[PDB]
Amino acid sequence: NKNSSYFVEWIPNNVKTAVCDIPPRGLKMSATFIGNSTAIQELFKRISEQFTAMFRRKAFLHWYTGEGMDEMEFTEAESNMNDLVSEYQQYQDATADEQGEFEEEGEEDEA
Amino acid sequence: PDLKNVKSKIGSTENLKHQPGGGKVQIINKKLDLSNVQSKCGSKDNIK
Numbered sequence: 001n002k003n004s005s006y007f008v009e010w011i012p013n014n015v016k017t018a019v020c021d022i023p024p025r026g027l028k029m030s031a032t033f034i035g036n037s038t039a040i041q042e043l044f045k046r047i048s049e050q051f052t053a054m055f056r057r058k059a060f061l062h063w064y065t066g067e068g069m070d071e072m073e074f075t076e077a078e079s080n081m082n083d084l085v086s087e088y089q090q091y092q093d094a095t096a097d098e099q100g101e102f103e104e105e106g107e108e109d110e111a
Numbered sequence: 112p113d114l115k116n117v118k119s120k121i122g123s124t125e126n127l128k129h130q131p132g133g134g135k136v137q138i139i140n141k142k143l144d145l146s147n148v149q150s151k152c153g154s155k156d157n158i159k
Binding site for chain 1: 121123125126129130133134138140
């Protein structure tokens with residue numbers, strides 16, 4: 001309720017709880033978080049923009065093609081990462097939209 | 112002396128064809144069909 005705008009709004013109630021009775025050693029209580037933010041796209045943005053700057057120059061690339069990797073292997077990988085990143089944008093801030101397009105009225109003067 | 116021609120070896124000069132190129136993404140959405148559906152209780156016609 002305090003933070004609703006950091007949540008994908010077409011996935012209403014975003015939580016899974018589990019509660020074990022048995023604490024960490026010699027201590028009263030704890031909890032463990034596993035979160036799925038879209039903000040994770042910033043790390044794979046970085047690593048794709050970084051890769052791009054080594055790869056459009058053949059930096060370090062002799063060492064890995066030297067272990068037999070074809071240029072298609074790094075290009076499929078980068079493409080694959082880029083697709084994951086393009087998707088993460090398409091999950092981010094998204095609305096409950098239903099994929100319609102602009103339409104207009106006909107006529108009632110039948111022949 | 113004369114060198115006639117000489118050039119660098121090997122880097123960004125040998126990369127100038129391959130960008131690489133990008134792609135396109137799409138949703139990830141559907142509907143359901145409602146055209147079969149009627150209520151499953153139903154007494155009000157018994158007025159007949």
